[PDB]
Write an enzyme that holds these catalytic residues in place. Structure first.
Site, short mmCIF file in Angstrom:
data_model
loop_
_atom_site.label_atom_id
_atom_site.label_comp_id
_atom_site.label_asym_id
_atom_site.label_seq_id
_atom_site.Cartn_x
_atom_site.Cartn_y
_atom_site.Cartn_z
N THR A 21 -45.21 27.15 -59.42
CA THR A 21 -44.11 26.97 -60.35
C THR A 21 -43.37 28.20 -60.84
N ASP A 48 -49.86 24.74 -59.94
CA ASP A 48 -50.28 26.09 -60.27
C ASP A 48 -49.25 26.80 -61.13
N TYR A 53 -46.01 33.34 -66.35
CA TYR A 53 -44.88 32.66 -65.74
C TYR A 53 -43.91 32.22 -66.81
N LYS A 82 -53.70 30.68 -65.68
CA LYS A 82 -54.39 31.92 -65.44
C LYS A 82 -54.37 32.80 -66.68
N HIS A 115 -56.20 36.20 -63.92
CA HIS A 115 -55.03 36.51 -63.11
C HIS A 115 -55.06 37.78 -62.28
N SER A 164 -58.43 35.57 -59.25
CA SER A 164 -57.23 35.76 -58.46
C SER A 164 -57.03 37.26 -58.27
N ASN A 165 -56.62 37.68 -57.08
CA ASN A 165 -56.40 39.09 -56.80
C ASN A 165 -57.66 39.92 -56.90
N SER A 215 -47.85 32.87 -51.77
CA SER A 215 -46.85 33.61 -50.98
C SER A 215 -47.13 33.19 -49.54
N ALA A 216 -47.70 31.99 -49.42
CA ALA A 216 -48.06 31.42 -48.13
C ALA A 216 -46.86 31.20 -47.23
N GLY A 218 -44.25 33.46 -47.29
CA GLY A 218 -43.56 34.74 -47.29
C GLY A 218 -43.14 35.26 -48.66
N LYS A 268 -44.22 26.93 -53.39
CA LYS A 268 -43.28 26.78 -54.49
C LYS A 268 -41.88 26.50 -53.98
N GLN A 277 -40.35 17.95 -48.51
CA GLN A 277 -40.69 18.33 -47.15
C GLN A 277 -42.06 18.96 -47.02
N1 NAP Z 1 -52.23 34.68 -58.82
C1 NAP Z 1 -51.22 35.40 -58.31
O1 NAP Z 1 -51.33 36.64 -58.33
C2 NAP Z 1 -50.04 34.75 -57.74
C3 NAP Z 1 -48.99 35.56 -57.20
C4 NAP Z 1 -47.84 35.07 -56.65
C5 NAP Z 1 -47.68 33.70 -56.61
N2 NAP Z 1 -48.69 32.81 -57.12
C6 NAP Z 1 -48.49 31.33 -57.04
O2 NAP Z 1 -48.13 30.92 -55.72
C7 NAP Z 1 -46.89 30.20 -55.74
C8 NAP Z 1 -46.10 30.49 -54.46
O3 NAP Z 1 -44.88 31.20 -54.78
P1 NAP Z 1 -44.34 32.48 -53.98
O4 NAP Z 1 -43.08 32.96 -54.56
O5 NAP Z 1 -45.46 33.44 -53.90
O6 NAP Z 1 -44.03 32.15 -52.40
P2 NAP Z 1 -43.83 30.80 -51.53
O7 NAP Z 1 -44.63 29.72 -52.03
O8 NAP Z 1 -44.09 31.42 -50.23
O9 NAP Z 1 -42.24 30.38 -51.57
C9 NAP Z 1 -41.10 31.42 -51.49
C10 NAP Z 1 -39.96 30.57 -51.23
O10 NAP Z 1 -40.08 29.72 -49.94
C11 NAP Z 1 -39.13 28.64 -50.12
N3 NAP Z 1 -39.67 27.33 -49.62
C12 NAP Z 1 -40.59 26.37 -50.08
N4 NAP Z 1 -40.75 25.37 -49.25
C13 NAP Z 1 -39.92 25.65 -48.20
C14 NAP Z 1 -39.63 24.96 -46.96
N5 NAP Z 1 -40.21 23.81 -46.65
N6 NAP Z 1 -38.71 25.54 -46.08
C15 NAP Z 1 -38.10 26.73 -46.38
N7 NAP Z 1 -38.33 27.43 -47.52
C16 NAP Z 1 -39.25 26.84 -48.39
C17 NAP Z 1 -38.79 28.63 -51.55
O11 NAP Z 1 -37.51 28.61 -51.80
P3 NAP Z 1 -36.97 27.36 -52.72
O12 NAP Z 1 -37.72 27.32 -54.02
O13 NAP Z 1 -35.56 27.66 -52.83
O14 NAP Z 1 -37.23 26.18 -51.88
C18 NAP Z 1 -39.58 29.77 -52.15
O15 NAP Z 1 -38.80 30.38 -53.12
C19 NAP Z 1 -46.23 30.63 -57.07
O16 NAP Z 1 -45.23 29.74 -57.62
C20 NAP Z 1 -47.39 30.81 -58.00
O17 NAP Z 1 -47.77 29.65 -58.72
C21 NAP Z 1 -49.90 33.30 -57.70
C1 IU5 Z 2 -47.79 39.55 -62.59
C2 IU5 Z 2 -46.81 38.73 -61.83
C3 IU5 Z 2 -46.97 38.85 -60.29
C4 IU5 Z 2 -47.91 37.85 -59.74
C5 IU5 Z 2 -47.64 36.33 -60.07
O1 IU5 Z 2 -46.47 35.84 -60.00
O2 IU5 Z 2 -48.67 35.75 -60.33
C6 IU5 Z 2 -45.28 39.06 -62.15
C7 IU5 Z 2 -44.31 38.12 -61.34
C8 IU5 Z 2 -42.96 38.10 -62.14
C9 IU5 Z 2 -43.24 39.08 -63.33
C10 IU5 Z 2 -42.31 38.94 -64.62
C11 IU5 Z 2 -40.79 39.19 -64.30
O3 IU5 Z 2 -40.30 38.20 -63.34
C12 IU5 Z 2 -39.91 39.10 -65.57
C13 IU5 Z 2 -40.33 40.15 -66.63
C14 IU5 Z 2 -40.11 41.59 -66.07
C15 IU5 Z 2 -40.53 42.61 -67.14
O4 IU5 Z 2 -40.30 43.95 -66.62
C16 IU5 Z 2 -42.03 42.45 -67.55
C17 IU5 Z 2 -42.20 40.99 -68.08
C18 IU5 Z 2 -41.86 39.89 -67.00
C19 IU5 Z 2 -42.02 38.50 -67.71
C20 IU5 Z 2 -42.76 40.01 -65.68
C21 IU5 Z 2 -44.26 39.84 -65.97
C22 IU5 Z 2 -45.13 39.95 -64.66
C23 IU5 Z 2 -44.78 38.86 -63.63
C24 IU5 Z 2 -45.08 37.39 -64.17
#
Ligand code: NAP
Ligand code: IU5
Length: 320
Positions: A21, A48, A53, A82, A115, A164-165, A215-216, A218, A268, A277
């Site tokens: 999300t 998630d 966030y 988280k 986190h 995580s991480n 980031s599955a 990209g 996401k 999809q």
């Molecule tokens: N614990 C951590 O450190 C951590 C870090 C990063 C992320 N996360 C979690 O993992 C989730 C994944 O987010 P992410 O930004 O990392 O990368 P992602 O899931 O790889 O998605 C990046 C983008 O791919 C597009 N997408 C989704 N489905 C698609 C499809 N079927 N065809 C083409 N494009 C598609 C989306 O664009 P659209 O939205 O425009 O469709 C999206 O912005 C996050 O929302 C978060 O909850 C956890």
């Molecule tokens: C730790 C995570 C990365 C991993 C994940 O997504 O789990 C990153 C992803 C986006 C980042 C926020 C950013 O968009 C907006 C703002 C920028 C300010 O400079 C600092 C505050 C904010 C709210 C950042 C905080 C850290 C965030 C939540």
């Protein structure tokens, strides 16, 4: 109902397809509320989110709205939150989780994570800074942090706890902690075909720790956080080819790849068409040749290095 789940090492069950999300601030939070609803509808039973966030208000309001709807029951929504690095200190965990719960308007989270391994100074600022732009790190025994997480799990505020991480060394630390009561149920780390953490995955598998990939697809590739020069995953040649042969999409193959690897994936998307999809990973299968084909795309392309936290001895990304 009836959706694909996996048995976590603590007896609980986690759906294999999770909906991410997070979104850039350039996007209004309202979008998060409408998106989650669309996800619930599409088939996503795993959501998630996080405190950082800054969207739990909307995300909760959503899942809460779909329960009131009669569209789903709480026992069919697997919500993850988280704990953020400005609350690793023991007496700060439960209050943090309680704060989230309050913004979500839920009585517990199905999963609660640590986190990121490196700590920062407690306080509102999620990423504190010196009057000189310096990040204000803090030092906390993560094992103490993990002890408070365990007390949350016991208080019934969190059904399952995990990390995580975390890298091999960190994961081990918790595992070998004196008087450990609950080994982390999972370790959510970046993981796609261009970085299929086999080494870590295997380790996790060997300890019955589920690896949740993020980031599955990209990643969002947000400018400050992700290097624009990195290759666009979904544009990869062999992923688009396989997409065609299967009459699906490169994204669906990145997702399905993960699934068959024994991994739980997060995808996401705020675009409705795409959200719906992604729920298609369950519609087809990959054959051993393809299974291996995608294994071959491995590179050392880590999208999120979060190196602004590079300092401390707990920075996770400089080992495996
Ligand atoms: N614990 C951590 O450190 C951590 C870090 C990063 C992320 N996360 C979690 O993992 C989730 C994944 O987010 P992410 O930004 O990392 O990368 P992602 O899931 O790889 O998605 C990046 C983008 O791919 C597009 N997408 C989704 N489905 C698609 C499809 N079927 N065809 C083409 N494009 C598609 C989306 O664009 P659209 O939205 O425009 O469709 C999206 O912005 C996050 O929302 C978060 O909850 C956890
Ligand atoms: C730790 C995570 C990365 C991993 C994940 O997504 O789990 C990153 C992803 C986006 C980042 C926020 C950013 O968009 C907006 C703002 C920028 C300010 O400079 C600092 C505050 C904010 C709210 C950042 C905080 C850290 C965030 C939540």
């Amino acid at each position: 109902s009836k959706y694909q789940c996996v048995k976590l090492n603590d007896g609980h069950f986690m759906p294999v397809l999770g909906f991410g999300t997070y979104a850039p601030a350039e996007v209004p939070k309202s979008k998060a509320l409408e998106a989650v609803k669309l996800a619930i509808e599409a088939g996503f039973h795993h959501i998630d989110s996080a405190h950082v966030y800054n969207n739990e208000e909307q995300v909760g309001l959503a899942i809460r709205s779909k329960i009131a709807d009669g569209s789903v029951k709480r026992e069919d929504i697997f919500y993850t939150s988280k704990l953020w690095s400005n609350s690793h200190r023991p007496e700060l965990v439960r209050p943090a989780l309680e704060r989230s719960l309050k913004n979500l308007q839920l009585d517990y989270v199905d999963l609660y994570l640590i986190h990121f391994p490196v700590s920062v100074k407690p306080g509102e600022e999620v990423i504190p800074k010196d009057e000189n732009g310096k990040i204000l790190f803090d030092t906390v025994d993560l094992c103490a942090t993990w002890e408070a997480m365990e007390k949350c799990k016991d208080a019934g505020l969190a059904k399952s706890i995990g990390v995580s991480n975390f890298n091999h060394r960190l994961l081990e630390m918790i595992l070998n902690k004196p008087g450990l009561k609950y080994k982390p149920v999972c370790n959510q780390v970046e993981c796609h075909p261009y970085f299929n953490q086999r080494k870590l995955l295997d380790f996790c598998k060997s300890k019955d720790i589920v690896l949740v990939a993020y980031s599955a697809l990209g990643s969002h590739r947000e400018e400050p956080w992700v290097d624009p020069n990195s290759p666009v995953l979904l544009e990869d040649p062999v992923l688009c080819a396989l997409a065609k042969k299967h009459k699906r999409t490169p994204a669906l193959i990145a997702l399905r790849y993960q699934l068959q690897r024994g991994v739980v994936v997060l995808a996401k998307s705020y675009n409705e068409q795409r959200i719906r999809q992604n729920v298609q990973v369950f519609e087809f299968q990959l054959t051993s040749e393809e299974m291996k084909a995608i294994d071959g795309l491995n590179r050392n392309v880590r999208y999120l290095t979060l190196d602004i936290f590079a300092g401390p001895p707990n920075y996770p990304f400089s080992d495996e």
